[PDB]
Symmetry: D3
Subunit: 230 residues, 6 copies
């Protein structure tokens, strides 16, 4: 029963997972999630606490966990010891909060909203048309779920897809994960003892369906240095 | 005559090649082949001794050398100190045996057969159609060729393409290498003093023609953790 | 005014930039440019002093700075301590000279011409047609501009696109950068205090528009080791 | 005047130094100091935020910057994402506070005192006598000095060597650094534009005079796992 | 009860420890022990499967785990993919066997004996006298203990110190560990659930008491290349 | 005859050695020697082209190969892309020249003389006395020896030990190495086909007998930033 695919999946990155459960039990956070994501995610992706910036000199607020393209990113900024990432590079943004409740849900929606409100550029490619903008994943990462009734959480998580604050995924470590399905066109909540690894696999699945990074308009950033003649 | 492209090609990764010739002469193995491949192959690929697993909880036997996609692999399992790789990540599988003879050919074909019999998934992409499954390269890596007659080896290597045990490529270090050509639609054997480097270039050429990793169905692995509702 | 996108852009890789300005002031070089490029460029690219070779056993002269694809390159050669790069891997080639004048412009054009005259291969892909050959960027990297009149430099830089010596981009550190625009179908010179970073953003933009590496014909290099039967 | 030893000294690790000055100007912190120390210090040393623990199951409070021996440390602990360092490994402990004033001086003295009150072991060596315990350096790292009168800071920093809270060194970035001299047997304050680099050289000098790590009594930690018979 | 020194000690390198327990349970090996040691040991030491060689062209048999000085070693040999270490660099040598029984004890003693029988050199230092030769630690590493009676294992482990096969330390993973005490001048066996971590701390303690690598007589190896005149 | 200590010694770092022989045959250089040394030398040492500087603001000329203490060095400077090393950190200095003749011998003696003329500091240690200054090894590294008569080279290499230009060691790759012996109190020349590896082992032997880095007077460098009160 060791060489059971089920067992291999649970044992995958066991150590970082164990760090998260201890934190959950010490509450009964932020850095563990960043660590967790960077272990599970393929090389193309990196996770970090960070601000997001766009080529219109607009900045998000500090985002507890940003997942961005490290491999094909043309630049990432460092002010002091802070990371500032171009919006075009961002795949997902998460709020971290100890507890999953109506208020932190709303707090997550506002952080996600502030990133999606940024302006992202996308060029055409040799001549194809410019690529559709990636749909940025928004979520909430918590240690203890305070909405024990699946109805009392289902309700406060029903948000419209046009809404820029909508949460695509979220987790209460070792307790439950939720996510939005398109086939079903609804939110779905799953209460499971292994919800952290199941949440991660869901995340990998949504990342895989995001789409390829569009071509950044590098001149839309370079215009902050020199003029252009039409 | 040093700055001759011919010489540059022979000098390429000269050290790992020298390790292989010594082993050939000490016989008159496994770790050398893995080292050799990991030096010649581009960053996308990695070679390792490993088991292969599929999302149906089927396992190959231990494969002396697996070449897999390390860059775009969503997960690789580590049981004890053993590597277990999802079948969708596999480009090539090799049997290592001291001598190239009818029996080790058959032993190679059975290992290859066991990996290709695994179930591999492939999703559609945004909506394109799902990508064709990669054609997994199967081979046999040896130190000394015991079929000196090119007719006596040609015969025991003529296998049908529809057969899942068919060997696409193989080598007897510093002696000969064989491979299947599609234009010619047959096997081809080459006896050459520099057969190790020529075998590697043939491998690089087949890898290049494999195709891109299909999109793994991550939920087909994630189902081992949580149910899904249709 | 610290958290101004303008300031973030200037502060990006500030240290290597500072190394370049000191050299400019010590003249009032080569290694600084290589260092500079390897910090600004995304992971796919690497910069290095090197010779370029093709599958016809032709070699360029030593190129002060080659930008090549390290991620998807199937091989790079090392004679002694010299780097020798297959022409198919080359994105850009630069001459380095202390001063920007008519003679070093001509010297750059001849080095660039010698690389573009090499033979580059390109295969079809599964069956699509073989990819168009990348357009290799040629430039000239200098410390002090000796053509102060924008007319007196504009003139000696007007070359025809069909000419294999034509220079696509160039820089006189912390003074000016030039580049060819297709929309405008002319050369363009920009005299700016921050010309080094603006030059780099222009380079990133041209690299982005280059196209993906064509599929190298590995057998056109492997033919240097073994014969082929038609 | 570039190749002036004075200039080389100022230019040393210029980039991390620049990060510190920006923070100083943004206040007009913690991570910058750690970054700064890890660049200036030789390989034997590492700096990190951390708790300190002894073999009597006593813990300090969280220490903003601990400098410990990473080379010869037999173990370092990781609770969740927290670093916990055996007291025997500690060379220096620093409080970080935006401003240098009487209250943050006292706050530093209490943190330093809590580390020096821990129990540190030291064995004999083959048979020589057990090494004297290292004298742990205590300091205070700030951005802006609020005691402008050198008398008004001198006074609140005159402490006795027998006191476990005594501060050996401290800095107000790009403004002043203080330190205790044994020859002089007093504190000394230095107000200098380049006070950050001078502070660092003073730190290197005190570290050099600390003494080599004593031999840790590993069984005094191992007793937490198994009993011993006398 | 998480921030209990006891708990930190048990959690230290928890992952590699877990790998070892699984192997113990799959038996109800070699690579796990090497991995385990390389995580617990300080930077000075490295563990590896290897042959040991001396300057008299004598070789041990293959040693399942050798612990050697990687930091101050002047050379290590690589034949094929095998590691060959000069005897002067060796701190400890271990036999790995699934079960702890009289026969594997004897097999361990014979491997240890073969390494200690090698000739080790030691020069004087500036002029001090040559350093005493390190006492090489010998042990046996197993998964399951088959001598359940502590008298039935005590008996077959009482060996004289003057014997070159004597075992200084050994372990049956998560079950028991033994070691020789000099104060007590006997062997000591400890049966404990956490015997793996306690065994490691005992190993660290013995390594610490070994002594410093003597100065290797480099010319005693160099004589294999050129003559010397007296 | 493969597992012959003689063979292992010749095979040690075979690849970098092969690079050197090719250069020797292409002459019939500098970077190969640096590479060679960094492969053979233990971790404490690093080799690099560099200037040497002392705390009296004196600089050597550029030294083709400096061997310095990277591990215990408190600082190393970087002007532009040049390395500048404090004299106290230097173990050996070499001139590189294609041919070994009277003139390049004299050229080497002058470079060595210029480094040894620098001022090196050395403090006392807790209170022991200050350590004797390391005896800096001087040598000459060449590809072809033009003094074929061992008398015609013996003569031009007899220099007095008090002379600051004296050469302690040198090599004509794959041809001969010389060195100074104290027992013999003379120079010694050895003509051997494997002279490169024998030269390296001689170098390792002299390095081992150099002595430990003395304690640098860090304030003798820090005085370039701030005054001191006696």
């Amino acid at each position: 029963q060791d060489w059971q695919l089920s067992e291999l999946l649970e044992n995958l990155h066991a150590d970082v997972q164990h760090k998260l459960t201890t934190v959950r039990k010490s509450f009964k956070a932020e850095n563990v999630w960043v660590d967790l994501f960077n272990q599970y995610l393929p090389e193309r992706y990196r996770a970090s606490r960070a601000f997001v910036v766009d080529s219109e000199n607009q900045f998000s607020e500090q985002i507890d966990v940003v997942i961005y393209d490290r491999q094909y990113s043309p630049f990432i900024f460092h002010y002091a010891e802070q990371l500032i990432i171009p919006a075009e590079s961002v795949y997902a943004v998460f709020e971290v909060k100890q507890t999953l409740n109506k208020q932190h849900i709303d707090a997550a929606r506002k952080k996600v909203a502030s990133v999606r409100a940024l302006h992202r550029t996308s060029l055409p490619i040799p001549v194809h048309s410019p690529r559709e903008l990636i749909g940025i994943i928004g979520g909430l990462l918590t240690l203890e779920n305070e909405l024990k009734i699946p109805d009392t959480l289902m309700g406060h998580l029903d948000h419209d897809k046009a809404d820029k604050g909508m949460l695509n995924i979220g987790c209460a470590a070792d307790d439950c994960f939720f996510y939005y399905d398109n086939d079903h066109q609804r939110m779905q909540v799953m209460q499971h003892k292994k919800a952290t690894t199941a949440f991660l696999f869901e995340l990998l699945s949504q990342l895989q369906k995001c789409g390829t990074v569009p071509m950044i308009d590098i001149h839309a950033y370079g215009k902050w240095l020199t003029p252009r003649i039409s």
